[PDB]
Design a protein around this ligand. Structure first.
Ligand code: COA
Ligand code: COA
Lengths: 268, 265
């Protein structure tokens, strides 16, 4: 009844994960079933399937409880400024909303973590340095971001039993979409540096809610559901977890088209 | 919000001092709302104790393979090379001990000793010494990290944790001169470059009391008697009722406690 490193690797190959792939994972680890090495079995199986030339990624974000204290400008009151732990890509935890897997991947030796805290990705493998280098601090889900690099490299996204609305790459589609009324987030962020804490205003399209008004919180799940119903992507079990594997470029373009058909003015 | 500074003040108020080697057993949920989660506790401990001190915790490890028993403690041959081997840098801390040992283990600079079931994690001035050369047999006895904590005059902090989780009292069980001590043997897999390598580990069993006739949680009674004798300190760390005891004192108290009942003075 134990799911092993070998058995999960076989499930991953059966679903379409291939040697050399760059694979970003969204997991609901409890749905995989009985795991012999806990969540680390999932990470190992992904690395076994993808080989030393591939890369395993996950969405990290970070635990910034201090955001409950910021004013309407997104700035930290002076009374709290020196009590807020600054972001350090090597020490700051992955956000707890994203599950156990991003944090377990972050603390796997060799894993790198990009520099934009809220948009940070973790990467482990051959192109981890490229994925995590020079993450732009403003609009960190757009051009030059790890998500943009995942599309460029022909990477893939694996929903390992996770709800389909957690597909972070669709925030990149939100950034690219040519639509009016895009919601913007501004937040002050402290960065750990060799000379001490540096504070910096971060501006981006807001990813805590849909990019524009008139959308349900989980409307990403609808985009993926329509994507799968249209015959794109792959479906199958990884352990006990029903899973979907999609092409990063395909789901991004589908998401942009989806948004621009509904709120934009598309071509034909 | 409870902050790094306020928790460090609570720790100093309770008796944690500059340069101390402090071993922590925590129930993080009782400390209250923390601005940097459990890492605030680790930071406050290092701030209170300073660069000359050391922060420690009991790591153990998740050896779910132990559920594939055989009563002599051996892994069936079909599983011997599917069992995840112990790697001191990569194996997780056991989850029975709470989130704090694992958060401390993955703090950069933290080291972890080589006896998997008895493994301690240490961060600070003497972390390399504390975690070095952990004997594979009787890893709660002489030359162990727990013995080194006693030797260094360290302290143990029960940070809202149930008092029976005080791992150092297993060292008192090892030291106690008493008959009928129960012994555990188990096969343990170690990760090596050429594949998994095995070690038969022998130790006094720490899953149950050292001898028969004791309550499962009798460590908590020992700590209560220790405090009732006027030793150690109690107080709040954040919202967490806490106990701070001297490692050498509680060990000697524990040895005497066991030797009054089953041994001889
Ligand atoms: C929210 C969500 C994570 C909840 O799913 P979940 O499986 O219940 O939570 P996790 O993924 O962290 O899995 C936890 C499992 O891993 C194990 N686990 C967790 N921490 C562990 C630890 N320190 N040691 C050993 N095992 C551990 C546990 O066995 C646990 O299973 P259990 O509670 O049944 O015993 C999931 O629905 C999801 O959304 N995943 C994608 C997250 C994401 O990418 N979000 C992006 C922002 S929208
Ligand atoms: C079993 C025991 C750990 C349960 O106490 P607990 O406080 O409920 O569990 P933890 O210590 O791991 O604290 C978890 C808290 O830290 C936070 N936390 C846990 N994981 C987190 C994560 N990835 N990110 C951010 N915060 C996290 C949570 O806020 C959680 O509190 P909540 O779930 O109530 O909201 C405790 O009773 C105990 O025995 N501690 C001593 C253990 C020991 O040393 N045993 C020795 C062997 S006998």
């Amino acid at each position: 009844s134990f799911a092993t490193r070998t058995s999960l690797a076989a499930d991953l190959a059966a679903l379409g994960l291939a040697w050399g792939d760059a694979i970003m994972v969204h997991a609901a680890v409890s749905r995989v079933g009985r795991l012999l090495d806990g969540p680390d079995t999932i990470i190992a199986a992904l690395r076994d399937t993808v080989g030393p030339g591939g890369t395993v990624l996950a969405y990290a974000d970070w635990e910034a409880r201090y955001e409950d204290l910021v004013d309407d400008a997104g700035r930290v009151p002076p009374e709290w400024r020196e009590h807020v732990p600054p972001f350090d890509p090597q020490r700051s935890r992955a956000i707890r909303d994203n599950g156990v897997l991003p944090e377990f991947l972050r603390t796997t030796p060799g894993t790198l973590r990009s520099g934009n805290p809220g948009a940070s990705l973790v990467a482990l493998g051959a192109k981890a340095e490229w994925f995590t280098a020079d993450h732009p601090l403003d609009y960190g889900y757009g051009e030059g971001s790890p998500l943009a690099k995942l599309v460029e490299a022909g990477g893939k996204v694996l929903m390992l039993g996770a709800p389909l609305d957690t597909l972070t790459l669709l925030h990149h589609a939100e950034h690219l979409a040519d639509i009016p009324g895009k919601r913007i987030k501004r937040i002050e962020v402290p960065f750990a540096t060799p000379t001490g804490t540096q504070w910096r205003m971060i501006e981006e399209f807001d990813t805590g809610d849909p990019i524009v008004a008139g959308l349900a919180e989980d409307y990403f799940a609808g985009i993926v559901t329509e994507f799968l119903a249209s015959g794109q992507g792959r479906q199958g079990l990884i352990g006990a977890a029903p899973s979907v594997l999609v092409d990063a470029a395909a789901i991004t373009a589908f998401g942009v088209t989806w948004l621009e058909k509904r709120f934009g003015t598309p071509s034909p």
